[PDB]
Amino acid sequence: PTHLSVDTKFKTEGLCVDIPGIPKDMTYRRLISMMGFKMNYQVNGYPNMFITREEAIRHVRAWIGFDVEGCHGTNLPLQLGFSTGVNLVAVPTPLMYKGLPWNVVRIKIVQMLSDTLKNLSDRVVFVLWAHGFELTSMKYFVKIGPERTCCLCDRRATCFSTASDTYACWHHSIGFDYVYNPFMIDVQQWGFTGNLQSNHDLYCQVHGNAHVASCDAIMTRCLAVHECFVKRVDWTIEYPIIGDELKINAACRKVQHMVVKAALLADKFPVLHDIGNPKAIKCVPQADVEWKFYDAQPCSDKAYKIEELFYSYHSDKFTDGVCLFWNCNVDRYPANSIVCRFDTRVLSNLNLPGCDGGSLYVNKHAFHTPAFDKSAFVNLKQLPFFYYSDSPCESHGIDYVPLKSATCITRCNLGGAVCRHHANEYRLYLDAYNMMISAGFSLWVYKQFDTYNLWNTFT
Numbered sequence: 195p196t197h198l199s200v201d202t203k204f205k206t207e208g209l210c211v212d213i214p215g216i217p218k219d220m221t222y223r224r225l226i227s228m229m230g231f232k233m234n235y236q237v238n239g240y241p242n243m244f245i246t247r248e249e250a251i252r253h254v255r256a257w258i259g260f261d262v263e264g265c266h267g268t269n270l271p272l273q274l275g276f277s278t279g280v281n282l283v284a285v286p287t288p289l290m291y292k293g294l295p296w297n298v299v300r301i302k303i304v305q306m307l308s309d310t311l312k313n314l315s316d317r318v319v320f321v322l323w324a325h326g327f328e329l330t331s332m333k334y335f336v337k338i339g340p341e342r343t344c345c346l347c348d349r350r351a352t353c354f355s356t357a358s359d360t361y362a363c364w365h366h367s368i369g370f371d372y373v374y375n376p377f378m379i380d381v382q383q384w385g386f387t388g389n390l391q392s393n394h395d396l397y398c399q400v401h402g403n404a405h406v407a408s409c410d411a412i413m414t415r416c417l418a419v420h421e422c423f424v425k426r427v428d429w430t431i432e433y434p435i436i437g438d439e440l441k442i443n444a445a446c447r448k449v450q451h452m453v454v455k456a457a458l459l460a461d462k463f464p465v466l467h468d469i470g471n472p473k474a475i476k477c478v479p480q481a482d483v484e485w486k487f488y489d490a491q492p493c494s495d496k497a498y499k500i501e502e503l504f505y506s507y508h509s510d511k512f513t514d515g516v517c518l519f520w521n522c523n524v525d526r527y528p529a530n531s532i533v534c535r536f537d538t539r540v541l542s543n544l545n546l547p548g549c550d551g552g553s554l555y556v557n558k559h560a561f562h563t564p565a566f567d568k569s570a571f572v573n574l575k576q577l578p579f580f581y582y583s584d585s586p587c588e589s590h591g592i593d594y595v596p597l598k599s600a601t602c603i604t605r606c607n608l609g610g611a612v613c614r615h616h617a618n619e620y621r622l623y624l625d626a627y628n629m630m631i632s633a634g635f636s637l638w639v640y641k642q643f644d645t646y647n648l649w650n651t652f653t
């Protein structure tokens with residue numbers, strides 16, 4: 195069992211209002227055939243158009259919700275909706291486009307999926323809540339064949355052109371008209387009771403139904419994300435590198451060491467309550483502080499209630515010392531805290547839209563994070579940038595232009611002139627900091643934190 199078998203049963207009950215008379219006994223093999231696609235007995239990397247829930251999870255970056263509503267069935271016009279917010283109307287002859295024929299519609303579909311997916315995936319997985327018209331309309335914009343490579347590169351073929359009889363990946367498809375070898379999954383096969391909106395609305399108040407096809411496409415992908423990443427968490431699935439994953443993570447470790455090392459020198463707390471990830475290490479191992487760890491896994495549903503994390507009888511007195519919440523999302527942080535909270539609103543290739551305002555951050559692993567809430571930080575202030583260093587002023591070993599900056603907290607800057615070594619480190623750390631901030635991370639600290647207190651650690 196590597197893939198989904200074509201001889202697997204397909205529950206057709208969700209299809210008999212668009213397709214009345216549909217046989218109850220149905221397989222994926224018969225379904226694909228009914229849809230207008232001939233598989234020719236090809237053993238060439240595309241065993242089935244439909245995929246498993248496990249394969250859908252491994253390729254979540256490729257998910258695009260898809261819904262088709264009959265505006266009036268090859269006689270009446272159709273409204274095609276995608277989780278990108280696009281609405282295309284096809285005539286057989288939230289971006290609501292007017293009625294145009296299929297030969298122009300398929301060109302817009304290729305453009306759209308390619309621009310959306312080229313920096314996320316090698317494929318498209320159409321997430322469906324199948325009623326009938328979406329499966330029957332695929333023959334109008336989808337070509338299937340053996341697995342292929344791009345005509346201009348080595349990435350797998352995701353598009354095909356009838357004008358030039360060639361195949362292309364998502365990056366080299368300009369002008370292409372057919373969606374080559376797509377993937378799909380039907381959420382109704384996962385055994386839900388009730389209609390799409392009832393099931394979606396049980397866990398999400400952000401996506402509202404309007405009746406347009408794109409609203410259903412959005413609710414479908416959202417519901418599929420909740421099922422596979424909110425109420426089900428598989429932290430063993432690793433995801434490929436598609437951006438600055440290595441630098442974002444490397445930057446977060448440098449910023450964590452820096453921010454925590456300085457908080458301990460500035461306010462000399464006797465104890466540090468490290469709340470979060472059960473696999474954590476002391477980010478500042480040479481600190482005098484008493485480091486006490488408390489296990490808490492990345493919540494995907496709702497943010498942790500600080501009342502359930504602490505209270506119920508551990509230092510018990512968390513108000514003693516400082517609390518470190520590094521990516522441990524709570525409802526309202528205590529005033530004596532240092533916090534790194536990922537901002538779910540951030541626009542990036544690593545951040546995919548999620549469920550109930552949350553987002554699915556995929557970087558080595560998929561972490562669905564609850565919606566960013568500015569009110570969680572009422573007892574804290576934003577952490578200002580600063581570079582602190584106690585290291586000796588010695589160059590060892592890249593050209594130089596004098597560094598002038600107040601936020602470079604070093605012995606040389608105290609003594610009136612930054613050395614080359616610390617100026618290199620300041621700019622390197624400033625880029626690691628800028629990297630993490632733009633990736634969506636936000637830093638918060640107790641109101642009494644003052645960098646002026648770091649200068650007296652040089653005597």
Ligand SMILES: CS(=O)(=O)Cc1nc2ccccc2[nH]1
Nearest residue numbers: 230231232336337338356372
């Ligand atoms: C082989 S198939 O995908 O099942 C049917 C088909 N054959 C095509 C040739 C050109 C364009 C679209 C086409 N759809």
Ligand SMILES: [Zn+2]
Nearest residue numbers: 344347363366
């Ligand atoms: Zn290519």
Ligand SMILES: [Zn+2]
Nearest residue numbers: 398401416550
């Ligand atoms: Zn939703």
Ligand SMILES: [Zn+2]
Nearest residue numbers: 587606613616
């Ligand atoms: Zn120096």
